[PDB]
Amino acid sequence: MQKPVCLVVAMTPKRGIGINNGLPWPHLTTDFKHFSRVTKTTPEEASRGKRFNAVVMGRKTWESMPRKFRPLVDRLNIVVSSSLKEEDIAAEKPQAEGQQRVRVCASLPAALSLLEEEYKDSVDQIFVVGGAGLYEAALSLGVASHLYITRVAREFPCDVFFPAFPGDDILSNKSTAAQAAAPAESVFVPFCPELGREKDNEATYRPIFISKTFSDNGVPYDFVVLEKRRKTDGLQAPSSAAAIAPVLAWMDEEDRKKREQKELIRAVPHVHFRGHEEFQYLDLIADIINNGRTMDDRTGVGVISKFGCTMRYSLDQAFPLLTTKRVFWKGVLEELLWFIRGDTNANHLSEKGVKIWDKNVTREFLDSRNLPHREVGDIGPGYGFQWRHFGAAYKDMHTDYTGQGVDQLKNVIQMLRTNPTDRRMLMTAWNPAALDEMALPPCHLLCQFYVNDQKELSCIMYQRSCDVGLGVPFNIASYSLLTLMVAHVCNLKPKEFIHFMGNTHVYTNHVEALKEQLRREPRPFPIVNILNKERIKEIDDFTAEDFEVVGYVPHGRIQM
Amino acid sequence: MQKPVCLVVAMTPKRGIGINNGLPWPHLTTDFKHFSRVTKTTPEEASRGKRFNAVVMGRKTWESMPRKFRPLVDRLNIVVSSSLKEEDIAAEKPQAEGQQRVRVCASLPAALSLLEEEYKDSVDQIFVVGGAGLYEAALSLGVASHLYITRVAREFPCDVFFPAFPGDDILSNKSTAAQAAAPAESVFVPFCPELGREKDNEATYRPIFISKTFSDNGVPYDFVVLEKRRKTDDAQAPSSAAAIAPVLAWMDEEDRKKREQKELIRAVPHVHFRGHEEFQYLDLIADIINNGRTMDDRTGVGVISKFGCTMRYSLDQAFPLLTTKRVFWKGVLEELLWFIRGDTNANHLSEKGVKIWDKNVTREFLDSRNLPHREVGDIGPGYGFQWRHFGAAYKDMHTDYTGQGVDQLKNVIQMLRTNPTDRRMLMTAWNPAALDEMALPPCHLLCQFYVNDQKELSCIMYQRSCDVGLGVPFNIASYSLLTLMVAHVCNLKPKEFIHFMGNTHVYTNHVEALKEQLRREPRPFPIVNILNKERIKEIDDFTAEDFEVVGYVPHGRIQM
């Protein structure tokens, strides 16, 4: 074969692709466009006498399409079938000018042999576009060099599934090969197709491309490209760049001289296009381990730190709940609702199964802070108290503080509702006069809001100290969620959460676990919907039952 | 010629290169390395049967070199002289088979012919390395495709100067006689060397490379590469990339259609390597103008804004006092000293010639803040009051507030001296309970400090609102100077200033003036020295006379 073969498919995390000879989900507008652009684009125009691509499909997929869309315009359509006749297809509807006559072939080898022989001068690329029968044939034959997979993050009822294939761990968690009961079921994919099924000819598909998350009709999804592999596997003029190179070389020495020293950490290095926004997070971990400085801290553990780091997360299609390790969403939600209430009683959290604060409000820890007058659970005048009562005198976690101090959150919302271009829409929890009264000095300590010219809301949060391993994914979810709630009660659309970080670190004893996490490819982000919107007029109206997380498919626990 | 010729030189902004047949400045270590690396660089190594480069020099430069460097090792040395004898040079040292005999030639064309003829197979590159007589011959001949110039930012006394040349405005501001004495005094540079001084054959030298600023022995300097140009131009694996291309093509479509419908602004786009840290600032201005959103601010005058921007400035070799427009240094230093004192009386600044607060402390402006009881000049419980007395109740600018509030600056200095790995070394001016008592709500509102494993101090400052045109360069200088001061009284070395920015904008009526500034190539940064260091033990001990700015050579005023 001289023509490239590719597979294009959209599937759920359990590989579901259809039901009752239709698609399983509501219409996915961006995926529809992607399918058209990929299958219609000549290879010459993408890099940026009639030549065109071919689409090969099974009989049921052909019949599954509305007669309006079939044949797929501007591509050569081949249908694999034993019953359908070419003349009937031509007689289905008038053949527009310049379109190719639809061919019917008895197998996939026959379809490809026809394309190689009869369309030698005219077909550039070949796309196998379904269904399960033809996908199975093309995988078992080994002819697909790349798979274009739209990863639909939600599960739907399905009765037709894409075949299990080597590389399908990109879709969902697999119970290892040391905890698997038996070798996982899978088509054999020949690396060299002419050598067929031989032990030394086993291929697998590895991702080279993972996009940011899209959504349509409440369905999150993204786009990946897998490449067939063996299982065992700045520009200027040529005068300008050559003149500059000796100077760059000596200026670049120190970076090189300490870079190749150790073997650098890198997250899933085979992924070339790193569109997924979670790559910011994975690359930050690698950056700290590779380039941070090790020092002892207050507890004496040993930290590796950098100073001054940033990430940004889009909020308009999906929600940045990180996927390479599960985020404790219930803790995020309950603790944010607690902050918003101005509540300083951590027992109200603990009693909901949210224990994140409890180690820091023990009688022991409070006494260590020289706070023996604090009841167990009382965090002092901390986060939510400064948000809603900044500067008020603090007595204990049971006191009614209504009307005392500055209500920054109310001021922020009122300013967004009346003068959104204002440049003072800030909320701070850093009160130096109160730090000695708190169980813990605040960590996420400042946030600022911004509205552009299209009613789109953004938030920045500044964090003085960030454990990237444990706390950072939680902090991202908290302030992203805060941005959704503020946006809804201010009649704005949530756009971007921006994370500014001071001392950004990982603990040395976590390094091995983090290296294992950095072998994981990120999954598409879930969608967070606000329920009962018509009932929720003010920030205090939200409750824990007013949220749903849709399509969250994180990796499982760490092997350590 | 089949072999390239380049000039390598270090000069002051007045083109001074030497005095008493020596160099004018103390030893510049990094420039010495640069010279060695560039002139010994095989073309092989840099971009990544013995071959070597040649260095061509005048008799006095040869005599100027210490015996240990005479001849320059691993390079073929050619001395242009009418009096030096090759045989006398060869008798000075053993003539080893591993090194090249020094050659003497009567002129530069003879030196170049010898190189092309007798060293056809062995010489890769030719470097003219001084002095003035050889540089003038090489420029007038037209044979140098590139100039490697070390821009020494200080004037030193010199008796030997590099010839005036087209492109020497890279060094300093040109007086009104820019086009006047240049044709009379500037060397004519042929573009095609064989066509001599024909009016059609005029060359000029343009920067393609501007590095960050270095320093040694109290001297700031940077590295530029200029390329010869005509005057009349002035006034992974292929399969992976091809598989990915169609997906990127449709993903980029919306942004592709915005870029080609806009005239995109770019600072000095002929500069390809943009190592100078001021490019962060010029790039930010361009990005705001290209990609910011226009809205009417408080005054309704027109502002273009982004949200969430960052820059970082090194403090270990030079000081980031921006060069494409002069910064009001005296204002920077006096206002910071005023902050540190906890002073809230702007009259103390105004009587020193620093008027920057005057418009915001007038009777009219205070009355508009509903502060009729404020005396003219009283900024309220603002920046330096919050630094030294956070939380204290304000009465007026005459009150003695000793011992009142939290002295954040003192706490930070004490923590840096006793426990520098602490992650709570912050200082904040954002007091939401005091904001209505201030003339202006603080702009630069939080700063955090950090010490690494090498006693090196860094500082982050968060600014909620940044007029990039008029406020940001001043702000950069204020907190960089603060970091120098803090590091000194804590026995630390200043490392880096990190600028975190919220609402980041330019006013629409400054755009044309800003475009003019974006045509300016940055100059090397100056050095800021602290004088009388042994007399200065505490942050309160600094006075205005304890600082000197060394080698500051900014561009002049803007026409627009």
Ligand SMILES: NC(=O)C1=CN([C@@H]2O[C@H](COP(=O)(O)OP(=O)(O)OC[C@H]3O[C@@H](n4cnc5c(N)ncnc54)[C@H](OP(=O)(O)O)[C@@H]3O)[C@@H](O)[C@H]2O)C=CC1
């Ligand atoms: N989500 C997605 O990306 C896609 C979803 N789909 C969904 O998948 C389902 C249809 O796929 P499916 O149901 O598997 O049916 P197919 O589209 O695979 O067509 C099956 C028929 O094609 C012919 N055929 C298939 N494989 C072979 C083979 N190896 N050799 C010879 N002939 C072959 C036979 O035709 P005959 O019996 O006439 O000989 C067979 O009955 C529908 O629900 C559809 O909506 C379809 C495409 C992509």
Ligand SMILES: NC(=O)C1=CN([C@@H]2O[C@H](COP(=O)(O)OP(=O)(O)OC[C@H]3O[C@@H](n4cnc5c(N)ncnc54)[C@H](OP(=O)(O)O)[C@@H]3O)[C@@H](O)[C@H]2O)C=CC1
């Ligand atoms: N900062 C820098 O980058 C450098 C600085 N320097 C400084 O520059 C000074 C020396 O430079 P300079 O004083 O200009 O003297 P040169 O090094 O240029 O040597 C001058 C001598 O070289 C010969 N010569 C020079 N030009 C020609 C020509 N066009 N044709 C023929 N012979 C020529 C003559 O030698 P004869 O009289 O024997 O015929 C002339 O007297 C020193 O102070 C040195 O330290 C030097 C190099 C680099």
Ligand SMILES: CCCCCCc1nc(N)nc(N)c1-c1ccccc1
């Ligand atoms: C008729 C065109 C629908 C295009 C959107 C659905 C789709 N998406 C992807 N990524 N791959 C596919 N193969 C298909 C598809 C193509 C043909 C029929 C059914 C589904």
Ligand SMILES: CCCCCCc1nc(N)nc(N)c1-c1ccccc1
């Ligand atoms: C003995 C070599 C000293 C190298 C440092 C001084 C220097 N810097 C630059 N950028 N260009 C130059 N041509 C020279 C130079 C080379 C030889 C003699 C004097 C100055």
Ligand SMILES: O=c1ccn([C@H]2C[C@H](O)[C@@H](COP(=O)(O)O)O2)c(=O)[nH]1
């Ligand atoms: O919301 C939070 C709270 C805490 N931490 C981590 C960062 C530090 O490792 C530790 C806080 O201790 P100090 O910075 O105060 O030393 O907890 C977070 O990452 N996010």
Ligand SMILES: O=c1ccn([C@H]2C[C@H](O)[C@@H](COP(=O)(O)O)O2)c(=O)[nH]1
């Ligand atoms: O240190 C400062 C102080 C002020 N500004 C600018 C930013 C704003 O354009 C203006 C203050 O206006 P508001 O953001 O407060 O509206 O002054 C600065 O850039 N730096």
